[PDB]
Amino acid sequence: KDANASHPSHSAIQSLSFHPSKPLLLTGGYDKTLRIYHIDGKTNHLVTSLHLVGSPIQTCTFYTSLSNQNQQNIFTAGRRRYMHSWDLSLENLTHSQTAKIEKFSRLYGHESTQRSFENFKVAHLQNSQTNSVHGIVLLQGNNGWINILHSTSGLWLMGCKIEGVITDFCIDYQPISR
Amino acid sequence: RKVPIYNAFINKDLLNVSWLQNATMPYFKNLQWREIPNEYTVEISLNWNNKNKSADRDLHGKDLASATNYVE
Amino acid sequence: MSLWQLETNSQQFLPRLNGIIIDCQVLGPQGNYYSLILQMTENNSNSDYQFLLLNASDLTSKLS
Amino acid sequence: QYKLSVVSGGKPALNNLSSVTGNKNIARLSQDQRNYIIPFNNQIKVYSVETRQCVK
Amino acid sequence: STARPRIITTTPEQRYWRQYTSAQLVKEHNSVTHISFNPQHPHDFAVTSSTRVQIFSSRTRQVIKTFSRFKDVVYSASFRSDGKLLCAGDATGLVSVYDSYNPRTILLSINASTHPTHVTKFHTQDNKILATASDDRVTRLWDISNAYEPQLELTGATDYVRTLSFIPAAPHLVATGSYDGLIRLYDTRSSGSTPIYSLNHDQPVENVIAVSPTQIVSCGGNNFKVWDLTSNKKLYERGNFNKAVTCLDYVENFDSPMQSALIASSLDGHVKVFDPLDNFQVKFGWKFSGPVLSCAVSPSTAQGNRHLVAGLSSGLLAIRTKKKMRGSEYQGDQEHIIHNDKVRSQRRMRAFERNINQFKWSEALDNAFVPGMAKELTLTVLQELRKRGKVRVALYGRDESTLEPLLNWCLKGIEDVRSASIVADWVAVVLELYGNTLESSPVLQELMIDLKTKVRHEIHKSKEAQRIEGMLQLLT
Amino acid sequence: LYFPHISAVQIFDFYKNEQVNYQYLTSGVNNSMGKVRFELNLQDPIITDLKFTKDGQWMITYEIEYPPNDLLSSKDLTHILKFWTKNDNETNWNLKTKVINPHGISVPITKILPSPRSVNNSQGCLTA
RNA sequence: UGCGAAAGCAGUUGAAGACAAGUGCUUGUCGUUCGUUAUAAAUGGCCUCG
């Protein structure tokens, strides 16, 4: 059965994402709504929806902290100079009457490199000297620029530059030891 | 919106009704069917067009900790 | 309140706080919050301290 | 007939020692980071961060 | 953190009438005697001038229909309540009834009398009956069906009757005002032809209007008086007018802060607004080139732009008008949670406000003295800098070339009472701060010589003002 | 419980023992910028008297504005009276009238007394 | 600093110790004390979300 059959979308499905562990599917688009469905293969009912006024969704994704498994979070972005984060931890996803939403809109002096948050990806970075592991939000810049932010605090951690126009990027993990 | 009932339990004078909220989360309610009228519709508050209120903002989006400015 | 980015010597600002900043701290495993103490030096008769816990993500008062 | 009793609170407490700087704040955030403990001159208030209210 | 505060820089009833800004003066061939508004949308108004009646479109404000069949001068253009039918009077005494917006066809023609028929009005509650007034001094009541004899012939005026009015809520009552100075009330239910009672105006009556069911306002001579029929006496009278009042109109329940307004022409070029609630006291007035013979305002239910029309004996018609990606539009009707955080941008700041916010003290002062800068606005930026404690700071890096713009304004601002004190503070600093540069710069020296003469002149005025102040105390 | 802080009023609920509001009741350099160095010598307007009518729907505030130092007009204090009103549901007072230099120029309003309920239904006040 | 009104009316701004610089002597300072009611100046200005 189709995932969107129970509650149809009013635009193109710009991004799709399965939850890392739970049986959920997240949809987004220019409708500006984050519809989450419980994919069982036979009914596929809608768990929740969140309309973001004036925030078209070009890409959305679940995120689960690699250390604190209890931490769940959704990041969504569009052709805007801000990014939205939706904390699903504890009972925020279903029981809560309200959604805990944060807006990332500060680049800490690097506004010129970044025009839009629309193209982003989320990865895990292990701070080796302390051995702590945290999430990072990667962005695409105007001139080969990749801006890397802290997933929770939003601080600008580092930036990477390539020659020519950046077209796409991806993340690879190389284990070193235990 | 009507919420279908998929199971129910009735012991002596109380009746337990079960329904599914969100996708598969079961919710329950206990009622004394003896006193209930012939045709009775239980009413439940489900999220629908809920304006999202952040505890750190007021209605107009001004931060709570911030002080009110002076306007003539 | 100024966050100096020491890599590039840049700085991010949070202006128009309620009082002058006596103390600053980054309070969390990942620096989720900033805890500040404000003074409100207008009142010379008494020292009017205020504790402000800000969300590092969007710099909004999490608890005043 | 009449009787006197304290009702409201007072100023938040600080480590008012001249030499120590940067350790003036004594309030602490719980390990679960769901509430903030602040000592006052006459009491200790535990505020829930999520709801921004004095739970205890 | 809090948003940065913004720099802080008549009656409501007057402010409403000030919205009739757009003015058009049209020239007609002869004096415009009568002006009427169609009760129905689009509420086109008709003007009687010379031998023709012209209907003007409300939106276009131009002539759309012309009724030129009349051989001699025309004396009325009143519409019927439905607005389909308009009647007009003629000096020959013929009363002609035309269909509105169909000038060619003459639905009904009646010869009221051999003398001129100056007033012809449709009876407001009853469509069939039409009233006509003539210099014969008989105000005949005609019916559209019966065109050979009047239904009733009211008589008893010993002078010209030029004012007919129908009282709302009293369709049997009819009001007539003659140049005898007597306003006569008649009842059509009775035999008629004899007044119920007469009201003495002491001056020829130019127009009688029934503002409300119980109050009638009669404007004649140099004053207008409001009469209550239950008391049968004038409650109130206003004689602010200079020339003899000619025409008067009333509108109620319109969107103004005042529910009702009463406009009265003067024949002095004045038409002034009166509100019935406040004892018929003056709130507004307009002045025209010549005497006003007719005034009208758009009905309450104009449904669009309101109009104020004034008629002048020169034929000039004055009109004042009060003008009145396929998912982008989803809006989240079907969704569980709608989250809104968009905050509208603050109102655009001027150059001086931006400079103050950015701590550009010297540049903010420069923006104060620029060509085409409001005097009030120049005063705020000067006051703001003083309040911020930045007066010497704004004046440190300056020479004679960039000091003259400040002194030029000070030369003019010293006269103003509001800016006299401010000018004293800034001038005190620049003298205390540029004493040496003053000696070596000739142009600065003359900027003070005229300033000393002007500040001396203000001292004389203030001393003089104290003297008139002293004697004024003696009188009281 | 209303505390007239310097240039601002702190609304504090002693039943809950929590502050409910902080409002700026005067003009001046209050939160436009952080004063530093000689700017710190400036004195913002001081709210001297603050009172409520018996009905409680109106707030009367009396303020003194201090001129900056080192000017000719460095000694002419400006006394201001302001009338604020607020509906019970909302929390922010809206200024309704402002009287500059009441009683004359440089004459303080030493006392204020809201009127009793008998006269004008508690919508009057005396200033002395 | 005291009183008073906001105008004003009276009255203060001393001694020791230590350090630095210049040449025992001179000057200046004090996260030093006792006693009396008792210019500034390290190029250094306030965020983003249309």
Curated annotation (Swiss-Prot), chain A:
Subcellular location, record wording: Nucleus, Nucleolus
Extent of the WD repeats: 8-47, 52-96
Top-level taxonomic group: Eukaryota
Miscellaneous information on this protein: Present with 9570 molecules/cell in log phase SD medium.
Known role: Involved in nucleolar processing of pre-18S ribosomal RNA and ribosome assembly.
Similarity annotation: Belongs to the WD repeat UTP18 family.
Subunit: Interacts with snoRNA U3. Interacts with MPP10, UTP21 and UTP25. Component of the ribosomal small subunit (SSU) processome composed of at least 40 protein subunits and snoRNA U3.
Protein's name in the database: U3 small nucleolar RNA-associated protein 18
Protein's organism: Saccharomyces cerevisiae (strain ATCC 204508 / S288c) (Baker's yeast)
Covered residues, full protein: 239 to 416 of 594
UniProtKB/Swiss-Prot annotation, chain B:
Subcellular compartments: Nucleus, Nucleolus
Organism superkingdom: Eukaryota
Transmembrane stretches, start-end: none
Additional remarks: Present with 33100 molecules/cell in log phase SD medium.
UniProt function note: Involved in nucleolar processing of pre-18S ribosomal RNA. Required for optimal pre-ribosomal RNA transcription by RNA polymerase I together with a subset of U3 proteins required for transcription (t-UTPs).
Family, similarity comment: Belongs to the UTP5 family.
Oligomeric form and interacting partners: Interacts with snoRNA U3. Interacts with MPP10. Component of the ribosomal small subunit (SSU) processome composed of at least 40 protein subunits and snoRNA U3. In the absence of snoRNA3, forms a complex with other t-UTPs. This complex can associate with pre-18S ribosomal RNAs.
Protein name as annotated: U3 small nucleolar RNA-associated protein 5
Originating species: Saccharomyces cerevisiae (strain ATCC 204508 / S288c)
From Swiss-Prot, chain C:
Designated gene of the protein: NAN1
Listed transmembrane segments: none
Role played: Involved in nucleolar processing of pre-18S ribosomal RNA. Required for optimal pre-ribosomal RNA transcription by RNA polymerase I together with a subset of U3 proteins required for transcription (t-UTPs).
Quaternary structure note: Interacts with snoRNA U3. Interacts with MPP10. Component of the ribosomal small subunit (SSU) processome composed of at least 40 protein subunits and snoRNA U3. In the absence of snoRNA3, forms a complex with other t-UTPs. This complex can associate with pre-18S ribosomal RNAs.
Compartments where located: Nucleus, Nucleolus
The species this protein was found in: Saccharomyces cerevisiae (strain ATCC 204508 / S288c) (Baker's yeast)
Protein name: NET1-associated nuclear protein 1
Further facts: Present with 6560 molecules/cell in log phase SD medium.
Curated annotation (Swiss-Prot), chain D:
Compartment(s) where it occurs, according to its Swiss-Prot or TrEMBL record: Nucleus, Nucleolus
Subunit structure: Interacts with snoRNA U3. Interacts with MPP10. Component of the ribosomal small subunit (SSU) processome composed of at least 40 protein subunits and snoRNA U3. In the absence of snoRNA3, forms a complex with other t-UTPs. This complex can associate with pre-18S ribosomal RNAs.
Function of the protein: Involved in nucleolar processing of pre-18S ribosomal RNA. Required for optimal pre-ribosomal RNA transcription by RNA polymerase I together with a subset of U3 proteins required for transcription (t-UTPs).
Other comments on record: Present with 6560 molecules/cell in log phase SD medium.
Protein name listed in UniProt: NET1-associated nuclear protein 1
